[PDB]
Amino acid sequence: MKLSPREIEKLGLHNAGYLAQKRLARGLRLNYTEAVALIATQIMEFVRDGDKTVAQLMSIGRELLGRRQVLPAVPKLVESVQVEATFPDGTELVTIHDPIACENGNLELALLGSFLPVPSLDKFTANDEIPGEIIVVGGNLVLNDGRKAVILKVVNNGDRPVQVGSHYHFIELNPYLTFDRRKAYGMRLNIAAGNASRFEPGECKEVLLVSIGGNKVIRGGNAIADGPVNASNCIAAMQAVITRGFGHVEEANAAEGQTGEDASCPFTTVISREEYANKYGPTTGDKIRLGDTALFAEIEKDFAIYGDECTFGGGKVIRDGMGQSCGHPPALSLDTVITNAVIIDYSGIIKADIGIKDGLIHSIGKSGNPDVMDGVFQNMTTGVNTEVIAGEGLIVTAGAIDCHVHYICPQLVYEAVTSGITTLVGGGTGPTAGTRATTCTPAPIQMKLMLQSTDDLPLNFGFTGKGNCAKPDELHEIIKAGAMGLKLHEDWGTTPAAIDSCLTIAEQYDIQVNIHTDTLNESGFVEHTIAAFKGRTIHTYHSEGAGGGHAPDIIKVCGEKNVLPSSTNPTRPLTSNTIDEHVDMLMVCHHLDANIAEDVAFSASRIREATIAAEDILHDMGAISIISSDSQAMGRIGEVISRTWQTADKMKSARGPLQANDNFRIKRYVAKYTINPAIANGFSQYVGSVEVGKLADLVMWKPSFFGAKPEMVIKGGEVAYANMGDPNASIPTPEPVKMRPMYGALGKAGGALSIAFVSKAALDQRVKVLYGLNKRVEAVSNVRKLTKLDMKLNDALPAITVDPDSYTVTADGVVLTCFVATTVPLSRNYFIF
């Protein structure tokens, strides 16, 4: 067949269309991903037929699926569908804009060529009544306040069209525009940042101009006015205007003034507030729905000065001598700027530009060019050598950190980064019995190998040894080898003696101890394991206990001051299939028999509605500080983030507000998979939050998709993984769009962008050198003096009791009961399976 790659991919795309076609013919309402596959698939077939032109399919594509055939969110999610195919005259791109352009679509034609029977309308469900919607405050904003202003007559005396961007130095215009060049001096158009005025030939326009800000130095254009704005350089600019024949007619009468903050001043330009949000993303006071949850994030603070937003593109702001600085010291240009980002972080929900330098977050604030703009500090310069990642309208958060990882297969890793995870911590050596049961890399040799194995992958890694030992001998060895933490697991024996010996070792080496307790209460009940901690910091895995630990009351640990507790994700939150699923999963993982009295006793003692319900609440209470996966050993790597938001969404709907928005809950929860995993494991100076001085491990989200599927994963300042369409296409957006590794994941790049975390002892020996690692290696630290109070926004310490028969949990006197949700967000709207 001589299949080129693009042919192979389209076969896949087609397969997805056909599956969507089969669901449609069943009278299922299609989700976003289904609508897309189906339409791209048909477009490709119509091109194969050879009967239809591009202009035709542009129309035909709007009339396949109608409001009736799709889910309530789809008409807002599907802005359009793009695909390329081979027409009779070669490859052509077809864009279908607003494909849900009607009520009924055309079923016959949506299925045409599939040979699937065409369903009747009444086979489809009835329409129900907008993910990531921006709720704009009512009103207008005056651009560019407190600046000298002038209105000038401008003529296009050329024979061709001339168009001028918002930030072009007006004196430097095409010599064929005629106006008062002297009055234009130091001025630029008073219009929304990044648009333009178009002058057809012969046209006369009356233009509102406003003064440039900051240092008021003009660079570029025609070099008419090179230099700082002053009386002396004005005289020189005018000399050059005359000599070089730049169109000039004095307007002695021109209205002059300033942009004053009051009503009906003719120099001022206003921008409708809904429209501000659409161009540049939301600003202070606006709220943003997280994905299709019920959560709203309100912009708390904005660094933007209205009218100088950093937007990149033709005629736009980020151009030489305008928004892009020219003449500052080269070493301080930002490597990359992320423009107009909504940052959601435990430390604040804000609107800001983010500058990246040397793989690090260099600054957060208002960025651009100090020669032309007020308010640009010397650490936020967009310069010649600065790349641009456009955040307008998107959310940025820290890369997620999953601190309960089983390295069972390398593909867990791709699934992780693709969901928004950039750091993994746990143990394993591949698909062995030991690794499948416990987060342990047991032999020094295997430490060596896992570090070397994962050395090119664009994530930060930590590996943990087997902590189950009643003598320190072999623990010293595994830490010296490079383990950055130890796992105490019952399958290797978690006994008071092992617990003690392992914590004494943690005290010496400043590493975290993660524990899965003695479910069987073989050598003690939970109180005996707590006693054995002896007031020493310890991280308790899946603290609720479905995934392991003292039956039935391991959850008591969420009330010990020295315990840092996490949950794993599959019990999150309590939903209608939770219990059934987990019982059987337990039966499967423990090789138990549905028909034996005691097998079923063990399992009913392990998987308990009363405690999972309590887990939803303690999680909302900030009594459980972290959420993690338990990847392929009871939990799900790609669902750390979504299960966090699904827990938040359920609690918002069940419980009281926590402090006219959901900010306090949003920040509490984002902390559970970003900052708190980093604190617990001892590397929070390097990652876990959007703050200056930390790795620029950064995930871009569409608000409509937030918490389900991100756009782009930045690793150490460079794009590591991202949504990507047809590699052969004329743009990146045509089908099939899927998460693929990017330049940050090829060759040596993964290593240059990331950190392998080891113990200080291992680093003292330079295991980075010994092991031949190209990834940066750093030591973990500051882990032996943590208490629950060091967990950001999750420092609650209830008195917990658990009834040994009913399993009912009481916290601070209050019986904890929670309902069984029948659905969750961030699921049916997003996934093809």
The residues that are catalytic are 590
| Pairing outcome for strands 336-345 and 387-390 | parallel
* Shortest Cβ 769–its own copies spacing (Å): 7
From 73-81, 205-213, 305-313, 770-778, span contacting its own copies (CB under 8 A): 770-778
Q: Can residue 280 be called a binding residue for its own copies (CB under 8 A)?
A: no
Total residue length of the chain: 833
| Pairing outcome for strands 395-398 and 336-345 | parallel
* Shortest Cβ 448–its own copies spacing (Å): 8
Q: Give residues 427-446 in contact with its own copies (rule: CB under 8 A).
A: 445
Beta strands in 171-255 (DSSP E): 177-178, 187-189, 196-199, 204-211, 217-218, 227-228
Q: Can residue 633 be called a binding residue for Ni ion (CB under 5 A)?
A: yes
Q: Can residue 482 be called a binding residue for its own copies (CB under 8 A)?
A: no
- DSSP H helical ranges for 203-333: 231-244, 273-280
Of 12, 88, 727, 772, the one binding its own copies (CB under 8 A) is 772
Cβ(317)–Cβ(309) under 8 Å?
yes
Which of its own copies, Ni ion, none does residue 630 bind (CB under 5 to 8 Å by kind)? Ni ion
Retrieve residue 625's tokens: 């500080």
Give the list of residues 6+ apart from residue 400 with CB closer than 8 angstroms, or none. 419, 420, 421, 422, 423, 640, 641, 673, 674, 699
Burial environment of residue 506 by CB neighbours within 10 A (0 to 12, 13 to 18, 19 or more): buried
SS3 44: helix
Of 270, 770, 814, 815, the one binding its own copies (CB under 8 A) is 770
SS (H, E, C) 503-564: HHHHHHHCCEEEEECCCCCCCCCHHHHHHHHCCCCEEECCCCCCCCCCCCCHHHHHHCCCEE
From 215-223, 455-463, 764-772, 807-815, span contacting its own copies (CB under 8 A): 764-772
Nearer to Ni ion, 36 or 633 (CB): 633
Nearer to its own copies, 265 or 445 (CB): 445
Nearer to Ni ion, 183 or 516 (CB): 516
Distance CA 163, CA 154 (A): 12
Which of Ni ion, its own copies, none does residue 548 bind (CB under 5 to 8 Å by kind)? Ni ion
Q: Can residue 630 be called a binding residue for Ni ion (CB under 5 A)?
A: yes
From 285-293, 409-417, 556-564, 762-770, span contacting its own copies (CB under 8 A): 762-770
Which of Ni ion, its own copies, none does residue 652 bind (CB under 5 to 8 Å by kind)? none
* Shortest Cβ 491–Ni ion spacing (Å): 8
* Shortest Cβ 814–Ni ion spacing (Å): 28
Cβ(50)–Cβ(88) under 8 Å?
yes
Give the list of residues 6+ apart from residue 766 with CB closer than 8 angstroms, or none. none
Total number of residues binding Ni ion (CB under 5 A)?
Answer: 5
Amino acid identity at 465 = G
* Shortest Cβ 479–its own copies spacing (Å): 15
Amino acid identity at 414 = Y
Distance CA 3, CA 760 (A): 52
Q: Can residue 34 be called a binding residue for Ni ion (CB under 5 A)?
A: no
Nearer to Ni ion, 33 or 439 (CB): 439
Nearer to its own copies, 347 or 765 (CB): 765
Nearer to its own copies, 445 or 470 (CB): 445
Q: In the complex, which residue's CB is closest to Ni ion?
A: 516
Total number of residues binding its own copies (CB under 8 A)?
Answer: 6
From 693, 744, 671, 734, select the one nearest 714 (Cα to Cα).
744
- Interruptions in the chain after residues (C–N over 2.5 Å): 129, 659
SS3 63: helix
* Shortest Cβ 481–its own copies spacing (Å): 12
Q: Which residues face 815 on adjacent strands?
A: 810
Nearer to its own copies, 234 or 449 (CB): 449
Nearer to its own copies, 445 or 746 (CB): 445
From 276, 259, 137, 256, select the one nearest 193 (Cα to Cα).
276
* Shortest Cβ 772–its own copies spacing (Å): 7
H-helix or E-strand spanning residue 496: helix 496-509
* Shortest Cβ 764–its own copies spacing (Å): 10
Nearer to its own copies, 770 or 814 (CB): 770
Crossing angle (nearest 10°) for helices 473-481 and 496-509? 40
H-helix or E-strand spanning residue 37: helix 32-49
Which of its own copies, Ni ion, none does residue 180 bind (CB under 5 to 8 Å by kind)? none
Contacts of 739-747 with CB under 8 Å at 24 or more apart are: 739/418, 739/709, 741/414, 741/458, 743/718, 743/719, 744/458, 744/714, 744/715, 744/716, 744/718, 744/719, 744/720, 745/457, 745/458, 745/720, 745/721, 747/456
* Shortest Cβ 504–its own copies spacing (Å): 20
* Shortest Cβ 631–Ni ion spacing (Å): 8
**Cα–Cα distances in Å, from 762 out to 315, 483, 594?**
54, 8, 47
Nearer to its own copies, 137 or 443 (CB): 443
Which of Ni ion, its own copies, none does residue 633 bind (CB under 5 to 8 Å by kind)? Ni ion
* Shortest Cβ 771–its own copies spacing (Å): 8
* Shortest Cβ 761–its own copies spacing (Å): 12
Q: Within 13 Å of residue 356, how many CA atoms lie on the same side as its CB?
A: 23
Which of its own copies, Ni ion, none does residue 597 bind (CB under 5 to 8 Å by kind)? none
Q: Can residue 516 be called a binding residue for Ni ion (CB under 5 A)?
A: yes
Retrieve residue 717's tokens: 């300042």
Buried/exposed 35-68: b ≥16 CB within 10 Å, e otherwise: bbbbbbbbbbebbeeeebeeeebeebbbbbbbbb
Which of its own copies, Ni ion, none does residue 771 bind (CB under 5 to 8 Å by kind)? its own copies
Which of its own copies, Ni ion, none does residue 651 bind (CB under 5 to 8 Å by kind)? none
Nearer to its own copies, 481 or 796 (CB): 481
Nearer to its own copies, 246 or 771 (CB): 771
Burial environment of residue 428 by CB neighbours within 10 A (0 to 12, 13 to 18, 19 or more): buried
From 126-134, 544-552, 587-595, 767-775, span contacting its own copies (CB under 8 A): 767-775
Q: Can residue 126 be called a binding residue for its own copies (CB under 8 A)?
A: no
Q: Can residue 765 be called a binding residue for its own copies (CB under 8 A)?
A: yes
From 39-47, 503-511, 616-624, 765-773, span contacting its own copies (CB under 8 A): 765-773
Give the list of residues 6+ apart from residue 3 with CB closer than 8 angstroms, or none. none
Distance CA 529, CA 522 (A): 11
Q: Give residues 395-414 in contact with its own copies (rule: CB under 8 A).
A: none
Which of its own copies, Ni ion, none does residue 399 bind (CB under 5 to 8 Å by kind)? none
Amino acid identity at 91 = T
Q: Give residues 352-391 in contact with its own copies (rule: CB under 8 A).
A: none
Q: Can residue 471 be called a binding residue for its own copies (CB under 8 A)?
A: no
Which of its own copies, Ni ion, none does residue 516 bind (CB under 5 to 8 Å by kind)? Ni ion
Binding mask of the shown chain, residues 526 to 565, with x at each position contacting Ni ion by CB under 5 A: ---------------------xx-----------------
* Shortest Cβ 469–its own copies spacing (Å): 16
Which of Ni ion, its own copies, none does residue 169 bind (CB under 5 to 8 Å by kind)? none
Q: How far is CA 133 from the centre of its chain?
A: 17
Give the list of residues 6+ apart from residue 417 with CB closer than 8 angstroms, or none. 458, 459, 713, 715, 720, 721
Of 55, 231, 433, 769, the one binding its own copies (CB under 8 A) is 769
Cα angle for residues 190, 194, 200 (degrees, 5° grid): 75
Q: Which residues bind its own copies (CB under 8 A)?
A: 445, 765, 769-772
Q: Which residues bind Ni ion (CB under 5 A)?
A: 516, 547-548, 630, 633
